[PDB]
Scaffold this active site. Structure first.
Site, PDB file in Angstrom:
ATOM      1  N   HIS B  74       0.821  -1.221   0.000  1.00 59.83           N
ATOM      2  CA  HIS B  74       0.000   0.000   0.000  1.00 59.83           C
ATOM      3  C   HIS B  74       0.850   1.264   0.000  1.00 59.83           C
ATOM      4  CE1 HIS B  74      -3.056  -2.942   1.464  1.00 59.83           C
ATOM      5  NE2 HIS B  74      -3.800  -2.261   0.613  1.00 59.83           N
ATOM      6  N   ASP B 228      -9.103  -1.651  -7.592  1.00 60.58           N
ATOM      7  CA  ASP B 228      -8.437  -1.997  -6.331  1.00 60.58           C
ATOM      8  C   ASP B 228      -8.151  -3.499  -6.240  1.00 60.58           C
ATOM      9  OD1 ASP B 228      -7.408  -1.111  -3.928  1.00 60.58           O
ATOM     10  OD2 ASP B 228      -9.362  -1.158  -2.903  1.00 60.58           O
TER      11      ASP B 228
HETATM   12  C1  LIG Z   1      -9.695 -15.004   0.610  1.00 60.21           C
HETATM   13  C2  LIG Z   1      -8.210 -15.251   0.396  1.00 60.21           C
HETATM   14  C3  LIG Z   1      -7.397 -13.968   0.294  1.00 60.21           C
HETATM   15  C4  LIG Z   1      -6.077 -13.883  -0.192  1.00 60.21           C
HETATM   16  C5  LIG Z   1      -5.621 -12.562  -0.150  1.00 60.21           C
HETATM   17  C6  LIG Z   1      -4.262 -12.021  -0.576  1.00 60.21           C
HETATM   18  O1  LIG Z   1      -4.285 -11.457  -1.898  1.00 60.21           O
HETATM   19  C7  LIG Z   1      -4.374 -10.096  -2.137  1.00 60.21           C
HETATM   20  C8  LIG Z   1      -5.210  -9.285  -1.361  1.00 60.21           C
HETATM   21  C9  LIG Z   1      -5.310  -7.909  -1.595  1.00 60.21           C
HETATM   22  C10 LIG Z   1      -6.231  -7.095  -0.723  1.00 60.21           C
HETATM   23  O2  LIG Z   1      -6.889  -7.691   0.115  1.00 60.21           O
HETATM   24  N1  LIG Z   1      -6.322  -5.768  -0.878  1.00 60.21           N
HETATM   25  C11 LIG Z   1      -7.116  -5.000  -0.082  1.00 60.21           C
HETATM   26  C12 LIG Z   1      -8.326  -4.322  -0.597  1.00 60.21           C
HETATM   27 CL1  LIG Z   1      -8.764  -4.518  -2.319  1.00 60.21          CL
HETATM   28  C13 LIG Z   1      -9.100  -3.540   0.266  1.00 60.21           C
HETATM   29  N2  LIG Z   1      -8.773  -3.394   1.567  1.00 60.21           N
HETATM   30  C14 LIG Z   1      -7.688  -3.983   2.115  1.00 60.21           C
HETATM   31  C15 LIG Z   1      -6.821  -4.782   1.354  1.00 60.21           C
HETATM   32 CL2  LIG Z   1      -5.376  -5.554   2.067  1.00 60.21          CL
HETATM   33  C16 LIG Z   1      -4.576  -7.308  -2.621  1.00 60.21           C
HETATM   34  C17 LIG Z   1      -3.730  -8.061  -3.435  1.00 60.21           C
HETATM   35  C18 LIG Z   1      -3.602  -9.438  -3.245  1.00 60.21           C
HETATM   36  O3  LIG Z   1      -2.759 -10.167  -4.049  1.00 60.21           O
HETATM   37  C19 LIG Z   1      -2.855 -10.108  -5.471  1.00 60.21           C
HETATM   38  O4  LIG Z   1      -6.676 -11.871   0.373  1.00 60.21           O
HETATM   39  N3  LIG Z   1      -7.800 -12.718   0.658  1.00 60.21           N
HETATM   40 ZN   LIG Z   2      -6.050  -0.084  -2.331  1.00 60.54          ZN
HETATM   41 ZN   LIG Z   3      -7.612   0.491   1.244  1.00 63.65          ZN
END
Ligand SMILES: CCc1cc(COc2cc(C(=O)Nc3c(Cl)cncc3Cl)ccc2OC)on1
Ligand SMILES: [Zn+2]
Ligand SMILES: [Zn+2]
Ligand SMILES: CCc1cc(COc2cc(C(=O)Nc3c(Cl)cncc3Cl)ccc2OC)on1
Ligand SMILES: [Zn+2]
Ligand SMILES: [Zn+2]
EC number: 3.1.4.53
Lengths: 322, 321
Positions: B74, B228
């Site tokens: 981030h 996002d």
């Molecule tokens: C359900 C399994 C699972 C696996 C992940 C990990 O993967 C990812 C997760 C995120 C991700 O969670 N991004 C995020 C968003 Cl879109 C909104 N608020 C907080 C956050 Cl941290 C962004 C990029 C990733 O890799 C390509 O998150 N949930």
């Molecule tokens: Zn973001």
């Molecule tokens: Zn965010």
């Protein structure tokens, strides 16, 4: 002495809160909270030092504005004492835990703290730093919460110092959920959900309300405190009229403020185009009575006399429209 | 030489799968500034809104500076990428001539500020530690409320008010749309966002038609939400880099949790990790259900985005031992 005599009516709807404010030397929130905490045995249960509690209550009360005619410490005191009575209703006996009771009462006490006597829109339209901090969303209600919690950090003000981490997290979540629901923009969905609960209402073997999940538990607590917030018209007429005078006084000052600044005057805020009586009638018809009628159904027949007084009080305001 | 390669990289500005990591190194860690400026030129926003160029640059650099360099995921590269992805989603044929210039500015500005001053930890960690931020925001969308407030506060710095020539009306309306968009970037809002988008795919009116502000904003919120969550829909060498970066940040939070005797959050334990399984789970349960539904709204515009996603999912599967 005479104070102690007014304070025996603490479990009663229609406590003489203005008289308690005069006799306590403008400390109704402090004396009433302290009385309720002693009566509910909350100091013992949660290991609250009595001097910590009084220091906190004094600090909290000091952060309501004495220049503000309605949203001041007397109104806080009133909402607290009203919630206390609603919590004691027969249909809710042994339903809520000590921590849930403590949350609803703490929530009621802090629920308008540091209110400037102007609406959220006034604060949004002036581009105030508060609207900026809270992104124009429940600006005041977010502020009341952050102030109420922040005051725990002043000297000898942490009334929750002996609660475990789990208790503190639970309590804090419940308080936030309750105070954020005091925004009138949430009124219609709170009421809709109260109605739904009444439609699918369940009672235990002991004849008290069955609420078996967080959602339903917090819904009732939100609606209870919301009911206390909107309970003025359900009070003895002598009390209701003093509340009416104060809200209108506060509304008019906002109107004079908006006028000076060349803003659109908010509804009911124009002292030159006022129908105080007509407005009380419409307030009861569209907001207060719908809510209290649903509460009354939820706790039937506990609130029947509250609703009868409500209906008496509306007729008085009707009789007095010019 | 090094200034020339940047210029040729920014030519892919309107394409999905820009080489944003190259642009980050070539601009000397100024991806958000160079990509935002390019997009503002490409869209004629400096003219339309009469934003002085020095003011735009100063604001973009200020905003970018308030993303944390030490934060693996981030940071400013993530913001540049969400900005650029929104820009590409805005140019989809189904949405041609749908949104005004203010609505376009709103979505792009919102993408830009949507994570500014992100500490690299979740809302929960901030809640659980009793941080000042969580106290201010009452444990409710703590980071997202903060991102907004910082993005807006930075306009007040010296020669940073890029909306100085917008009228009172334009300012009020832009502000309200940016707030609506960034607040929906909270994942706690993902299910109601998806459902609401599913509803609109069904009662679809058509080049898409949008009647009220509810429907206009809902699409913009979901567009930025898709931007996002677009990492797995990207060419694999970009996606691999994003996965490495989020896992680094998650593991760092896990290390901080482990350290403090806290329960380690999901996917934050480097001693009990399944990077590949978690990515497949992420695709199956969040990213694909959303991109399928966006693809349905803009049919047939996102077929290749959805094909890349399905390809990347099968790649990560193969990698599971
Ligand atoms: C359900 C399994 C699972 C696996 C992940 C990990 O993967 C990812 C997760 C995120 C991700 O969670 N991004 C995020 C968003 Cl879109 C909104 N608020 C907080 C956050 Cl941290 C962004 C990029 C990733 O890799 C390509 O998150 N949930
Ligand atoms: Zn973001
Ligand atoms: Zn965010
Ligand atoms: C719709 C007609 C209408 C008329 C009024 C004026 O009456 C009253 C209104 C209120 C009143 O609205 N209080 C209030 C609440 Cl519960 C929550 N947020 C903000 C506020 Cl200002 C409290 C007491 C009143 O009379 C004694 O408010 N709405
Ligand atoms: Zn209030
Ligand atoms: Zn109140």
């Amino acid at each position: 002495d005479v104070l102690a005599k007014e304070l025996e009516d603490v479990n009663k709807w229609g406590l003489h809160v203005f008289r308690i404010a005069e006799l306590s030397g403008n400390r109704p929130l402090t004396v009433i909270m302290h009385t309720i905490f002693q009566e509910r045995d909350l100091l013992k249960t949660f290991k609250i030092p009595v001097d910590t509690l009084i220091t906190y209550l004094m600090t909290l009360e000091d952060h309501y504005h004495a220049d503000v005619a309605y949203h001041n410490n007397i109104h806080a005191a009133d909402v607290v004492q009203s919630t206390h009575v609603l919590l004691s209703t027969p249909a809710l006996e042994a339903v809520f835990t000590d921590l849930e009771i403590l949350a609803a009462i703490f929530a009621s006490a802090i629920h308008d703290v540091d209110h400037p006597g102007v609406s959220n829109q006034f604060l949004i339209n002036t581009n105030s730093e508060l609207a900026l901090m809270y992104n124009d969303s429940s600006v005041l209600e977010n502020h009341h919460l952050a102030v109420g919690f922040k005051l725990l950090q002043e000297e000898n003000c942490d009334i929750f110092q002996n609660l475990t981490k789990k208790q503190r997290q639970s309590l804090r979540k419940m308080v936030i959920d309750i105070v954020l629901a005091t925004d009138m923009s949430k009124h219609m969905n709170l009421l809709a959900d109260l109605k739904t609960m009444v439609e699918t209402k369940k009672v235990t073997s002991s004849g008290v309300l069955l609420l078996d999940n967080y959602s339903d538990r917090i819904q009732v607590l939100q609606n209870m405190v919301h009911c206390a917030d909107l309970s003025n018209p359900t009070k003895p007429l002598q009390l209701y009229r003093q509340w009416t005078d104060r809200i209108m006084e506060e509304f008019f000052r906002q109107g004079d403020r908006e006028r000076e600044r060349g803003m659109e005057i908010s509804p009911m805020c124009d002292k030159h185009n006022a129908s105080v009586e007509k407005s009380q009638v419409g307030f009861i018809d569209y907001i207060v009575h719908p809510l209290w009628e649903t509460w009354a159904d939820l706790v039937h027949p506990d609130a029947q006399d509250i609703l009868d007084t409500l209906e008496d009080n509306r007729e008085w305001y009707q009789s007095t429209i010019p």
